[PDB]
Structures are given as structure tokens and as C-alpha cells.
Symmetry: D2
Subunit: 320 residues, 4 copies
């Protein structure tokens, strides 16, 4: 009947899919998410005695404490208006965890939802982090080949923990009563196609003529007489989640103001892409597969078109 | 740290409201406390595209029990894809509470947020398995005149946070639910919505179904002003979620009439009236594109209307293009 | 009608005119305080991570009480004479009401192992006031002179923190029990006009002190152990917690007693802070509260920490012990 | 902040226990989290003979939480007593004997109650034969691996021992997680607190009457013993475990064998106390050195501080 994250994790290890060390890591990350989820809910009251960013920091500390049993954790400072990234390195040096505490620094975008994003890499042979460490992490963490697991935790009307250890996507819902994550969905599959596009059309006049065209053909009441549906929360995790469940396409293209997209490759795009690919979808930068793009910079950015396989291929068409 | 209950009892004290209404408002919040929990465990509950619908029903039952001490509650059933509306009539007959359990029947639109919407009227007329009939639905529409007898209104947003917004006729107050103590804590007094905001909330998928008036309006927003910064587009799909963000950060939200729906989708009495009374108390404007939503007297049972609601200046701007 | 919360129930009473908005806000604030104290009690172990363990808690609980009644009045503190719990006294800005609040029922970790609780009483002063928390001697003297249980004790109650959190209250017309719903954080009326059984073969005493009691008492204690009728003697139950032991006595009947002994010549329980509220409550539940000879409420506090023996519980049971103490 | 889960996984990683048992112990705790909530809302639940159906509901919750580990039958109560739930792993590596609530009386559960469990490693209602088979398999003095209880009172405490000391985990109301609040608990070698139901003083043996009397003698300090008796086995046992003293449920005239059942109550409690550095006797012998010949077997219990129990034994000799 009821399967908790812990039960589910131990079974996997019993099957030898993951080792105790990784079971502890994944368990600790979720522990952190249970606490971050609570900070988010009481944030208004907390403030009685702007706030979104101050929350990023607090969330990274909770993360560090929860993983003190597995390894030390440094921090990659937000270059720009970004969220500071916490990087944990196992004392064993067998696992590294890149953790994105909250999905945004804006209060507007976190009005109804937000979430954490994480990825786990395994080094081969080769508190703020310095330039000598940053360049090192960047080289050590390659999403394409050494990314073992990834997931996110959505904090919205419900707290969802999504995870993939390389063999499918599992969804665990947090039970408010018992403070535990219960498996509510196995091997999640994102629909092949969906009549839903998730873009910020406020920037329509900043997009390339390629994209303006794609965007325009969506508004054309198709075969039936029903045009695509537009949905854009502003929250990467929230918008991504809805795309994962109901299908469609999400996109954060490059514009006049942002010549190379806003979403960071290693911290946000890579985990989301690995997950979607396990859910049977596609994650592209417009012309190519996100995972193959090897990070050369610390806060490297890239355009994102992620979601249903047919929907993404469609946009790729207008952009070639 | 003022809680909803403390705040409520104080108002009753200044004579702004009577004990009866204090009990009503207090009961509604208890209901919302339970609905908030149904929403959060829904996935697990299902472990035992209609999940959003069953949830609507369960939520109305919770509402009924919590107000059993104040009066009887009937139901105006969801003909189409509308949400079934719960109507509570005080045993005293001094009040009637129109309650919208969830803001939608779609799972897609409730992916991250949803909410309850209520309005309280004071009948100036007579009296009136659980599903109300025609003769009564009529009675209610006739009895509830948003422009006059609408005394209080509010909503409870269920999202990354559970917020309860209320107005008793003298300002808008925001109460956050403390997870630890299971109580609503006053986190904001006399909320005022900004006069303008460069954020628009519309479903542009329907761009080609809109009037040429609107198409122009929408297009002029995407024009990077002299600051080289155009408008921001945000649309959750959730009436309560989209409305709330508009209330806090400013901007404009709109659910215009198109070709498929020549009269908009949002029902006048059940959704538009409460939201408009609230926004007008927050210093904003609620229009149907031409006239004040609260000026329209409800005449048909499931009457729908276009909605342009938000910052005073933003709404006046769209009314120009539609003039 | 189906779900009656404390708040609904209070507003209904004020409507009948039984109580005023001012008192409704006082009683409501006390329960708010009790909701937070309930939480301090439950997490105390964890709190201590990040045997006076119960003495600190007393203090913290009084601050929570003061903040919650901030809207109604100022609150000073009558410090612990010996191993007593510090008492918080709130005086309404209006001067219509005074609230004597006992944060926890004890200072011992042993006695609070499974339960503890808060006790409060509300008086309607006829005389003067006091200013601004440790209250001075003259200040404490005024409270004792102004708080006359037998004539101006308006309401009283307690909140038990055990396997369940119970809030019992009486506004002068019966005893009502409200259970705290964990899920919604609201007190739900679970019992109306509670009545304590006229009789009950149960006794709650600390027999460790058997050799320190009077020969009168020793003979009472002994006659209880005699397998009566069906050949079933009395049942002994003593948690150590005044609120816990009192509550069980109120629900299932019997007699609770904290008599004077060789060491404690006048008992241990304080008259005004502990015995008076409990007695008013039991009397409303149809019971009896005695000091062994006279009705507790007939006694008038004359000293700042006046203690007294307590025999409280079922009417017939208390009369039986008095018959011996005579 | 070490939570039960963290602590559990570490023990497994250390090879002290296997994933299978980790899952069992983890499931038991999920069950207790729910039972803890049933207990707290029982009054409200009744608004929509109490501590009796609560027993039942509690066993169902137990069954569901361990459905992932094994099948669970039930040993029906003869008289008033509590129905015992027995879970057998699908693997057949573990048998969990679960006592949902510590009592069937409302009087005794007025302020506290609790669950008691024991796990044996073998080398809806369960009928005679099944029972007859469990008594022969579950041998406390040889195959009892772990045991614990969850007290539901002013606080929700989960006590556990996997064979190497006693650990106490407090439930955090806010996060719904058991947090390790005490490592390697040790019960004092002596404590001046006795927990007995003196109402039955006249039904006790002359041996016991004399023990009881000598306790009331104000020692060289002019201080007699302190008497504390909640009525709750888990509640009275826990306080004894923390502050020391002695708890006892002796045999009287009517009950020539005591009231507490050997396998369901006395055994787990005794294993725990012995791990806390104490003693659990029936007045004459160690409790873990007694093997039932029927499951509903009852036995007198004298449990608590080592010195305190040895003293009563001296009087019982």
C-alpha cells in the first residue's frame, strides 16, 4: 500500500541500484526539503519579526547541516541576480551534490510556488568557493556523462519531491500529517504532445523572428477550433512540473536583453533535462540536446525548450 | 502577533460587526483550514481529469459542517464545467453566504494553486437531496445584489502558503496560516493595490478569438517603453492565484469575451462580484470592459461577464482601447 | 450545532448576555496562550537539545501568557516562595478583570513525566489597582486582598497537556470540556455540563507519606483497602500531577487529597492559586472541595502563599473523609 | 539534529541491521505517528468502550504500514484485554508482536497510553494452532532481537533497543519526525519511588505487605519513599526508566499469576530495562528466563532499578 521515500530507497539499495552512501545522501536532501518547505510557508510571519532572496541563504544552511554526515558543503555566490548555489562534496569524494535552494530570487515569481533543484555527480579521478574551486567543480561536474541522479522539490499548494536515479521518474507527495514523503506515482511519463505552451509573451518584441513565428502559429485555432493554451506561473519548478504532468512545452529563449538565455546550464537546465528525458520527453537549447553541452563557465547560461517530445521538435523546426 | 480570531473579536467589539457574523466568518476560516489540508494530501488520498472535481464536493461538505451552527446550506450545481456553489442561509435569515469551494474544476489549472471565494449578503426581502432547485436559484440571484447588500467578501488561497484575505467593508486584511499552531496570523493591515503595474494576466492562447480592440491593447503592452522594458506576462490559470498576485504586486488581470464565449466565462455573482468588492477596497478597479462590475444587477442564474480587474490606472487604460 | 469550537461557544454565551465582549476576549486569549504552552510542553526534549527542566518551562509559559493578554491588560509576576511555580497575574486595563494564572501545575520533572497543566481563575475586583515584572510585597498583598474566591471569582478553568490537550472551563453555569483538534488547531466542545459522579471507589493520595499523616487519616486510608461488597477494595491512582489527577477525578469520580503531614503542617497546595479554582470547578461539576473540615471556598486568603489541605472529588467520597477527620 | 530515520540508516550502513529490518523499524514508527494522532483526537472522533475500538483501529493502521514488509494476523482477546497484532515478514526472517495500546480501560488511559512491540527472528483472526505455533517460535530469552514502545502522553516518545543500549526519540510536532533526544539511556541503580496499586494491599501476600510497609518508613533522612502510579504500564514503566525506582504488578488472592501478560507486555519491557542496566523479575526469577506454554500467559512483574528489584526479591525469598 503506502510507500515512503525511505522504504523506496532501501528497496533500491537492496536491488543494488544504489549504495547505502547514496541512500543516505538522497535521504538527507529530502530532509532539507522538509525544512525549506516550512520556511517558505511561514515566511510572512517570519518577516514580522525582498524576503525571497534572504530565504535562499537560509535554505542553503539547512541543506549544509543535513548533509554534514555525508560531506562538506561550500557555496557558489550569485554572480548576478541569481540564487546562491550550495555544492556538497562527500568526505568520500564519491558523490557531489549541486543544490539550488529555491528556484528564484523574485517575490513576484514565488507568489504561489517555488522549489529546490538538485543534481548528483560522481567524480572520475580528477565557505564561499574560490575561483580555483569554481573552475574545478565546473570541470568535475559534467551533466552529460557523470550525472547519476537528479530531482527537485516543489513547494506549492502541495509539496512534491521528484526523483530519478537513472531508471525512471518517481513522484513522492509530502503527507502533512506524518511529515513523510509518500510515493504517489511510479515511472511518470510526460505526454508525447500537449496543446499548452509556457512562455513569457511580455518579451515577444525582444525575440527573434524565428520565435515570433512559432509563437504566432500556436495561436491559430487548429483542426478543431481550439488554439493552444497559455500557462506561465513564473516559477521554473512550478511551470516545469505542470509540463511534466500534463504535457506541453516550456521555454526560456534568448532575447535582445539576454543574448544567451537566463537559466544556468549546470544548476537549473541540466537536472530538469535529465528528469524530462527519463519521463520520455526532450530538453533542448533550440538546436541541440542540453546534456551534451559541456559547461565551460561557472554561471553559464543557455536557452531552454523542454517538455513533450513532439512539442519541442516543433519549436526546433521554426528555429533551425 | 495578532491572529484572525483575536482580530475578529476586536472588530465585533468596536461594533463593526455583530457576534453572529463573527461566528460566520470564524466558521468559514475553520472550513478553509480543513480544505487546505484536503488539497495538500489529495495525491495520497487518491492512493486509496476528475480529481479536482471530487475535491470540489468534499470541500463543500466541510463547509456545510462548519456552518451547521449558523444555518442550513443548499447547493447550486455545476451545469457545465463550473464549480458547484454552496449557499448558506442563516437560521436567523439576516445573512446568506455564497461559497465557491475551489476556484476551478481543472487539474491543469490547479497544478500549483487554487482557492475558495465567498461573499456575504444581507437580504432585504423574505425567506427562501441538498441541490437547490430553479425556484430557489432564482430567489438567491434576486436576493443577492452585490451593489448593495454585499457586506463582506474574501478568499483563501491554497498555494506554497495558505493566505486568507478578507474585507468587512473597511479595508483589506491578509492573514497567513501558521502551520505549527494551526492559526491564521494577521500579516497585513489595510492592503492597498498599486495604482499601476507593468504586469498583465491574460490567456494569449485565445488571442485570435478576441476583438480587434483587445488585440491592439495586448500588442501595445509588449512595446518596450522608453525604459526599454515592456510588460511582464504572468498567468497561472487559477483565478484566486492570479487575482492575489495582482492584488499584492499590481498589474491587470483579464478574462475577456471572445468568439466561443460571447459573454466571458466568469460568473457574475459567484466569482466577479466578490473579487471586485475586494479590489475596490484595496484601492483598485473591477470592470467588464465598460462598466463597474458591481453596478451590474444579476438577472440570470448562471450569468457570466468579462473581467478586467487590477490596478486603477491599468484597468482604465484597457477601458480606453475598448471605448 | 455539529462542530462547536471554543470561539463559537463563547460568542453564543456573550449573545445570551452571560458574559461581555471583554471577558470573551480574555477567555479566548487564555486558550491561545494554552495552545502555545501545549506546544512547548511537547517539544521540550528537543528544545533542550539545541532537574530544573520544569522550572525554566514555568517562566517561558508565563511570558507567552503575558503576550497573549497584551491586548487586554498588563501582567506582573508573583515569584515562587519555595519550590512553587511562579504565578502570573493579569489586570485588565479597564480594571474589570484580574486573571490569576498558574502556567504549569508543578516544578518537578518526576511529576510532569506524563502530564501537567495550567490553572486559571478570573476575579471581579471591587477595590483598587496596582502599577508596573516581579510584584512587590505591597503589590502582592493587594492581589490577595482583592481576590476573594468565595465572592468575586467569576470563572475558572485549566488546560491539561497529556495524551490529549483538554481545556476545561466554567463561567458560573456548568462545566464545559473542549478538546484540542491537532489538525485544525482549534478547541472543539466535546462535553456539556460535565457532572462528577456522587461516588467512586478510587482514591488519589501519595501513600509514601503514610507515616507522616494523622491517625485520623491513617484510619481512613486503611478502611479503603478493605474488600467491601463484591470483595473489591478501592482503586489507587496517583499521577503526581495536580491537573492530571484532578481531571481523572472529575471524569470518573473518586477523591483526591493532599493532606497536611508531619513536615507540611498546613498542606502543600496554595489556597488562592491552586485550591480555589479547582474547588469552584468541582462544585460546578456537582462535587465537593474541602480542607478536611470546612468548604475551601469559605476560607479567605489572608497570607501571600497560604497553603491548605485539599480533599476534592465526589460529594459522597469527600463527606466520608470529613466524617473521619471530624 | 539526528532524526530516527538518519539514525536508522546509519545502523544499517554499519551493518548492525539489514535493510529489511530497517524497513520494519521504520514502518513501525510510521504506524505510531498515526496512532499518536488517533489518541489525540479520540474525543472529537467520538462526537462523529472507547479505548476498546481504538484498539482495533490501531491494529489496522499497523497492518497497512507493514503491508510492505509482511502479512499480519490477530490474536483475539479472551476477556477485556487488548487484541495483539502479529506480523510475519514475507521473507519469514522476522515476526513482530505488536500491542497497539497498553490498556482497554478509559480510566487508565486518562493521561497516557502507548504501544509495545517486540521482534523475533525465527530459526483475519489467528486461531489456536497459529498461536500455539508463535509461542514455540517466539522465545524471548533466545530469539528476541529488538523491542520498544511508543508512549502517547503530554509528549510522544519512541523508545527502542536493537540489542546495544536504549535510545529515546521525541516526536517533533512541527516536522512530524522523531528526533534522537537521548543515547544509551541508563536506568539508575536505585531510586526512591515505588509504583504499585495499593488498593489491593489486602489481597497481597504477607511477604509483599511487609515490603510495602518498610517503604513507608522515613529513612535516616526522615524521608519515606515516593509513591507514583498512573495506571498505564507504558507511562509507569517510562518514568521508572528515566528517574529510577521500582514498578510492580504482583499476584493477589484472585489472580494467582498476576495480570500482565508475559509475551506481549513483560518480555519487551524486561529486555529494554536490562539494556538500560536494570532488572526485570517475577519475584523469584528473571523474566526472560521464562518461556510461555500458552501465549496469554500471565506473570507477576517487578521491574525497575537493579537494587530496588533485588530488595523486593529478598522479601519474597
Amino acid at each position: 500500500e503506502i510507500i515512503t521515500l525511505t522504504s523506496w530507497l532501501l528497496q533500491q539499495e537492496q536491488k543494488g541500484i544504489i549504495d547505502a552512501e547514496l541512500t543516505i545522501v538522497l535521504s538527507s536532501i529530502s530532509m532539507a526539503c522538509k525544512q525549506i518547505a516550512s520556511l517558505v510557508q511561514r515566511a510572512n510571519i517570519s518577516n514580522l519579526t525582498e524576503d525571497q532572496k534572504k530565504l535562499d541563504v537560509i535554505s542553503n544552511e539547512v541543506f549544509s547541516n543535513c548533509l554534514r554526515s555525508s560531506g562538506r558543503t561550500g557555496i557558489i555566490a550569485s554572480e548576478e541576480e541569481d540564487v546562491p548555489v550550495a555544492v556538497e562534496e562527500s568526505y568520500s569524494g564519491n558523490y557531489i551534490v549541486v543544490f539550488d535552494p529555491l528556484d528564484g530570487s523574485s517575490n513576484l515569481d514565488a507568489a504561489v510556488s517555488t522549489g529546490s533543484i538538485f543534481g548528483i555527480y560522481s567524480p572520475n579521478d580528477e565557505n564561499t568557493l574560490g575561483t580555483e574551486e569554481q573552475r574545478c567543480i565546473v570541470n568535475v561536474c559534467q551533466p552529460g556523462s557523470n550525472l547519476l541522479a537528479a530531482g527537485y522539490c516543489m513547494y506549492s499548494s502541495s509539496v512534491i519531491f521528484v526523483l530519478t536515479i537513472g531508471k525512471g521518474v518517481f513522484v513522492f507527495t509530502l503527507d502533512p500529517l506524518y511529515g513523510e514523503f509518500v510515493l504517489t506515482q511510479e515511472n511518470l511519463q510526460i505526454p508525447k504532445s500537449g496543446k499548452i505552451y509556457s512562455f513569457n509573451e511580455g518579451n515577444y518584441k525582444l525575440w527573434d523572428e524565428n520565435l515570433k513565428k512559432y509563437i504566432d502559429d500556436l495561436k491559430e485555432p487548429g483542426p478543431s477550433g481550439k488554439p493552444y493554451s497559455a500557462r506561465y506561473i513564473g516559477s521554473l519548478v512550478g511551470d516545469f512540473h505542470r509540463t511534466l504532468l500534463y504535457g506541453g512545452i516550456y521555454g526560456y529563449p534568448r532575447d535582445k536583453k539576454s543574448k544567451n538565455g537566463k537559466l544556468r546550464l549546470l544548476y537549473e537546465c541540466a537536472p530538469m533535462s535529465f528528469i524530462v528525458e527519463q519521463a520520455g520527453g526532450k530538453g533542448s537549447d533550440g538546436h541541440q540536446r542540453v546534456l551534451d553541452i559541456q559547461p565551460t563557465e561557472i554561471h553559464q547560461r543557455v536557452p531552454l525548450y523542454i517538455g513533450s517530445t513532439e512539442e519541442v521538435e516543433k519549436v526546433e523546426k521554426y528555429l533551425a
